[PDB]
Each structure stands twice: as structure tokens, then as C-alpha cells.
Amino acid sequence: SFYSPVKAGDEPASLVAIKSGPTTIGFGCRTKIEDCLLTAHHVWCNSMRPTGLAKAGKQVSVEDWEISMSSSDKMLDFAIVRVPTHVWSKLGVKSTPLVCPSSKDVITCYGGSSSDCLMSGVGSSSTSEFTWKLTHTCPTAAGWSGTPLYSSRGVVGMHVGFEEIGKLNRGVNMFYVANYLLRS
């Protein structure tokens, strides 16, 4: 009801699913921070090992790729991974820039329990006086961690969890993180 099905090929070109054997452990996007996969720390580092990247039924295995940066802070919860560029093209994944979030962004969020079985939510996203923090109303589920907060203007942030469970959700503002927190 709060969700619409999404046919493979109709999700954004940046969106990628993160698999651990049969299990989708979360989502991510291709972006620039150099060029990278951005997902949640708990998807990439605190779940069962990532073994593959999936997009629309297409699959590529995960090899010993470098984790450029990560934070296991509940409030940041990010992992920035250097995926060889051929893997991105094998999947047909196109980059998308991290745009600056605002007081109110209209957002779509995508997730599912398999690469080819995707659905979409809609909500709004808002910045905090705690600059690293976003809160949003996009309906998500278990396994939707690392999924980008897409606006018409672009990816404003990354979904990581809850603010209050089922009332208000939580993102990390990766724009602020990349500009003020991360060291080159």
C-alpha cells in the first residue's frame, strides 16, 4: 500500500543490491567521494560477508575490495568501497553525485528482498542541527539499509535506520560527512 512494485530496469541506474549468498543484506549506490560504492557500515561490515553485487537479476562476485573509509557509529554507519570500474559496467551501474540535503526534500526509497523483486516508497527528508543526521518519512523495511535517499535533484543521503521505529526513520548526511569528517 505504502509501496509500489518496481520492474527490473526501472530502478535508478546507481542503485545496487548487496548480497551475502542468497540473502540481500542491504543496498548501496555508485557515487563519487574517487569513484565508489556507498552503503551502510552494518551492511558491509557487521552482517554476513558480502559475496556479490546485484542489479536487476545481474550478479557480480565481490573480491578483496578496499574499504576506503567506514564508521561503526550508530549515527554515521557508512562504508565507502572501491569497486573495480569494470564491475560497475558489468552491472550497468551509473554513478550519481551526493547532493546537499535541505530542510525538506521529497524522496523515493527503493528496496526489496531480491535484486529483481524491488519496490518503492515515497516520503520527505530533513536535515538536523546535528549536521550528520537526516530524518525521513520514506517507508523502508528490514534489508533496506544503505539504500539512497533519492530526490529529483539527486541522492541527498543514505538510509541507515530508525529515529523512532515506524514513526520516523533515519539517514546519514553523507554530504557533510565527506566534506567535514573524512580525511583525504
Tab-separated table of C-alpha atoms in Angstrom:
chain	number	residue	atom	x	y	z
A	1	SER	CA	0.000	0.000	0.000
A	2	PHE	CA	2.789	2.411	1.007
A	3	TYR	CA	4.800	0.550	-1.639
A	4	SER	CA	4.731	0.231	-5.407
A	5	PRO	CA	6.335	-2.667	-7.243
A	6	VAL	CA	9.367	-1.827	-9.415
A	7	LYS	CA	10.156	-3.780	-12.577
A	8	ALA	CA	13.825	-4.637	-13.057
A	9	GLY	CA	15.403	-1.988	-15.280
A	10	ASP	CA	13.174	0.724	-13.789
A	11	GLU	CA	15.138	1.458	-10.612
A	12	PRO	CA	17.716	4.261	-10.703
A	13	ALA	CA	20.931	3.427	-12.588
A	14	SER	CA	23.037	3.970	-9.437
A	15	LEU	CA	21.114	1.513	-7.218
A	16	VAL	CA	22.781	-1.782	-6.403
A	17	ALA	CA	21.814	-4.658	-4.080
A	18	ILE	CA	24.348	-6.170	-1.698
A	19	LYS	CA	24.154	-9.962	-1.450
A	20	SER	CA	25.522	-12.460	1.045
A	21	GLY	CA	24.975	-15.825	-0.591
A	22	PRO	CA	21.209	-15.892	-1.218
A	23	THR	CA	20.466	-13.045	1.213
A	24	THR	CA	20.102	-9.382	0.299
A	25	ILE	CA	21.812	-7.751	3.278
A	26	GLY	CA	21.116	-4.210	2.086
A	27	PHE	CA	21.607	-1.701	-0.695
A	28	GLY	CA	24.033	0.901	-1.979
A	29	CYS	CA	24.736	3.327	-4.780
A	30	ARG	CA	27.612	4.179	-7.094
A	31	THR	CA	28.929	7.662	-6.360
A	32	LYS	CA	31.988	9.927	-6.008
A	33	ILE	CA	33.563	10.646	-2.631
A	34	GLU	CA	37.416	8.987	-6.453
A	35	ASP	CA	34.509	6.715	-7.564
A	36	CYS	CA	32.845	4.366	-5.031
A	37	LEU	CA	30.042	2.156	-3.740
A	38	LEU	CA	28.429	3.785	-0.715
A	39	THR	CA	26.495	1.616	1.715
A	40	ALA	CA	25.866	1.251	5.464
A	41	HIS	CA	28.673	0.026	7.756
A	42	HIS	CA	26.372	-2.635	9.135
A	43	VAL	CA	25.574	-3.973	5.672
A	44	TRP	CA	29.213	-4.104	4.508
A	45	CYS	CA	30.966	-4.876	7.800
A	46	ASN	CA	28.541	-6.077	10.514
A	47	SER	CA	26.449	-8.594	8.582
A	48	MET	CA	27.454	-11.865	6.923
A	49	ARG	CA	30.245	-11.329	4.388
A	50	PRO	CA	29.280	-9.552	1.147
A	51	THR	CA	29.755	-12.043	-1.658
A	52	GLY	CA	28.095	-10.272	-4.569
A	53	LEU	CA	26.597	-7.146	-6.065
A	54	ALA	CA	23.280	-7.455	-7.804
A	55	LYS	CA	21.299	-5.210	-10.118
A	56	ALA	CA	18.134	-6.322	-11.910
A	57	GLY	CA	18.960	-10.027	-11.846
A	58	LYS	CA	22.546	-9.395	-12.948
A	59	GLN	CA	25.195	-10.529	-10.448
A	60	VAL	CA	28.943	-9.968	-9.892
A	61	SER	CA	31.023	-11.538	-7.137
A	62	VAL	CA	32.865	-9.500	-4.520
A	63	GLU	CA	36.659	-9.830	-4.287
A	64	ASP	CA	39.084	-8.245	-1.754
A	65	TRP	CA	38.000	-4.633	-2.451
A	66	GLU	CA	39.434	-1.802	-0.383
A	67	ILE	CA	37.274	-0.098	2.213
A	68	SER	CA	38.395	3.492	1.687
A	69	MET	CA	36.531	4.559	4.850
A	70	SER	CA	33.933	3.460	7.400
A	71	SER	CA	32.309	4.361	10.705
A	72	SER	CA	30.568	1.944	13.046
A	73	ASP	CA	28.986	4.845	14.901
A	74	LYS	CA	25.225	4.249	15.039
A	75	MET	CA	24.816	7.814	13.767
A	76	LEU	CA	27.186	7.570	10.799
A	77	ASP	CA	27.088	3.884	9.819
A	78	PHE	CA	28.792	4.072	6.443
A	79	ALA	CA	31.195	2.081	4.313
A	80	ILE	CA	32.916	3.503	1.236
A	81	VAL	CA	34.199	0.714	-1.011
A	82	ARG	CA	36.440	0.845	-4.073
A	83	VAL	CA	34.819	-1.435	-6.644
A	84	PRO	CA	36.818	-2.024	-9.840
A	85	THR	CA	35.229	0.056	-12.617
A	86	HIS	CA	34.638	-2.930	-14.908
A	87	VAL	CA	32.359	-4.457	-12.250
A	88	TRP	CA	30.194	-1.321	-12.392
A	89	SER	CA	29.889	-1.685	-16.188
A	90	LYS	CA	29.338	-5.452	-15.974
A	91	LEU	CA	26.286	-4.481	-13.875
A	92	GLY	CA	25.304	-1.416	-15.852
A	93	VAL	CA	25.624	0.813	-12.787
A	94	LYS	CA	25.955	4.540	-13.466
A	95	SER	CA	27.386	6.964	-10.872
A	96	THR	CA	25.285	9.672	-9.146
A	97	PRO	CA	26.657	12.623	-7.183
A	98	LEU	CA	25.969	13.260	-3.499
A	99	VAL	CA	23.900	16.438	-3.453
A	100	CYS	CA	23.365	18.738	-0.456
A	101	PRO	CA	20.285	17.906	1.686
A	102	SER	CA	17.760	20.564	2.762
A	103	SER	CA	15.055	21.225	5.365
A	104	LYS	CA	12.595	19.295	3.184
A	105	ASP	CA	13.380	17.055	0.230
A	106	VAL	CA	10.762	14.887	-1.474
A	107	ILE	CA	12.300	11.423	-1.635
A	108	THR	CA	11.855	7.983	-3.115
A	109	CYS	CA	13.451	4.946	-1.493
A	110	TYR	CA	13.949	1.554	-3.095
A	111	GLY	CA	14.335	-1.869	-1.533
A	112	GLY	CA	13.245	-5.485	-1.685
A	113	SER	CA	14.418	-8.949	-0.727
A	114	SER	CA	15.871	-9.702	-4.148
A	115	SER	CA	17.535	-7.682	-6.951
A	116	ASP	CA	14.678	-8.385	-9.408
A	117	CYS	CA	11.894	-8.055	-6.791
A	118	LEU	CA	12.164	-4.366	-5.951
A	119	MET	CA	9.576	-1.970	-4.513
A	120	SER	CA	9.447	1.797	-3.911
A	121	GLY	CA	8.474	4.136	-1.093
A	122	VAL	CA	7.975	7.904	-1.016
A	123	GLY	CA	8.470	10.356	1.836
A	124	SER	CA	10.319	13.526	2.740
A	125	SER	CA	13.801	14.039	4.165
A	126	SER	CA	15.008	16.750	6.550
A	127	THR	CA	18.355	17.906	7.864
A	128	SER	CA	19.194	18.333	11.568
A	129	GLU	CA	21.105	20.834	13.673
A	130	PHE	CA	23.144	17.640	14.114
A	131	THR	CA	24.532	18.017	10.599
A	132	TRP	CA	25.489	14.339	10.071
A	133	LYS	CA	21.909	13.307	10.810
A	134	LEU	CA	18.947	13.142	8.426
A	135	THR	CA	15.458	12.074	9.436
A	136	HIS	CA	12.955	10.952	6.804
A	137	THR	CA	9.463	9.504	6.304
A	138	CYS	CA	10.179	7.163	3.388
A	139	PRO	CA	8.782	3.733	4.313
A	140	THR	CA	11.555	1.156	4.426
A	141	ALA	CA	11.942	-2.377	5.753
A	142	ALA	CA	14.395	-4.976	7.008
A	143	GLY	CA	17.181	-5.241	4.425
A	144	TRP	CA	16.777	-1.662	3.103
A	145	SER	CA	19.957	-0.407	4.786
A	146	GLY	CA	22.342	1.578	2.614
A	147	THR	CA	19.593	2.478	0.196
A	148	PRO	CA	19.945	6.061	-1.099
A	149	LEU	CA	17.532	8.877	-0.361
A	150	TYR	CA	16.842	9.892	-3.984
A	151	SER	CA	15.322	13.239	-4.845
A	152	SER	CA	14.679	14.802	-8.255
A	153	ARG	CA	17.807	16.832	-7.547
A	154	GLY	CA	19.681	13.602	-6.636
A	155	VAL	CA	20.890	11.499	-3.681
A	156	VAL	CA	20.543	13.709	-0.586
A	157	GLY	CA	21.605	10.996	1.924
A	158	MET	CA	21.728	7.292	2.843
A	159	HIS	CA	19.171	5.231	4.749
A	160	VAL	CA	20.674	3.586	7.829
A	161	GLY	CA	17.817	3.061	10.316
A	162	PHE	CA	15.192	4.443	12.693
A	163	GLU	CA	14.638	7.616	14.684
A	164	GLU	CA	11.511	6.135	16.263
A	165	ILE	CA	10.555	2.689	14.912
A	166	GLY	CA	7.617	3.047	12.485
A	167	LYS	CA	7.053	6.747	13.115
A	168	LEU	CA	10.249	8.413	11.865
A	169	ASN	CA	13.274	6.968	10.042
A	170	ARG	CA	16.948	7.980	9.986
A	171	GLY	CA	19.603	8.754	7.389
A	172	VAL	CA	23.236	9.792	7.462
A	173	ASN	CA	24.003	13.039	5.654
A	174	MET	CA	26.993	11.793	3.665
A	175	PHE	CA	27.490	15.205	2.038
A	176	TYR	CA	28.522	16.675	5.412
A	177	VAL	CA	30.448	13.508	6.260
A	178	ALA	CA	32.502	13.670	3.036
A	179	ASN	CA	33.145	17.407	3.379
A	180	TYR	CA	33.838	17.773	7.109
A	181	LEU	CA	34.576	14.395	8.656
A	182	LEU	CA	36.586	12.327	6.204
A	183	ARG	CA	40.350	12.806	5.704
A	184	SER	CA	41.823	12.580	2.203
